[PDB]
Amino acid sequence: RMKQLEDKVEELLSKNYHLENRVARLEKLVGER
Amino acid sequence: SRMKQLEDKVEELLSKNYHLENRVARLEKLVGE
Amino acid sequence: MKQLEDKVEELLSKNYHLENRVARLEKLVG
């Protein structure tokens, strides 16, 4: 139950990191227009 | 419950990340990059 | 458990800020 939480939080930490990089790419692209 | 509150927050984050990623993917389709 | 709460607060903060950045892009692209 705790292990289930830990795994999901780890997934979320990773997913947030990678999603932010995609947002930063968009910001770069849109900002150079 | 302190544990229940944590599980709720995690479920919230999982939902939020799903939906936010879809919004980012949409932007990526629109930007074409 | 406390370390997990800290990570979750981190995620909640990061999601909030990231969403606002996504919202700004939606206005611009939109």
Domain ranges across chain A: 1-33
Place of tokens 């930063």: A24
Phi then psi dihedrals of residue B32, to 5 deg: 80, -15
Which tokens belong to C10?
């981190």
Query: CB of C9 within 8 A of CB of A15?
Result: no
Q: Which of C1, C11, C28 sits opposite A13 (nearest CB)?
A: C11
Report resolution in angstroms: 1.9
Kindly list the residues of chain A whose beta carbon comes within 8 Å of any beta carbon in chain B: 1-2, 5, 8-9, 12, 15-16, 19, 22-23, 25-26, 29-30
The DSSP secondary structure of B1-33, one letter per residue, reads -HHHHHHHHHHHHHHHHHHHHHHHHHHHHHH--
Distance CA A27, CA B26 (A): 14
The conformation of residue B33, written as its DSSP 8-state character, comes to -
For helices C2-29 and B2-31, what crossing angle results, to 10°? 30
Distance CA A12, CA B30 (A): 25
Q: What is the 3-state secondary structure (H, E, C) of chain A?
A: CHHHHHHHHHHHHHHHHHHHHHHHHHHHHHHCC
Cβ atoms within 10 Å of C25's Cβ, excluding its own: 22
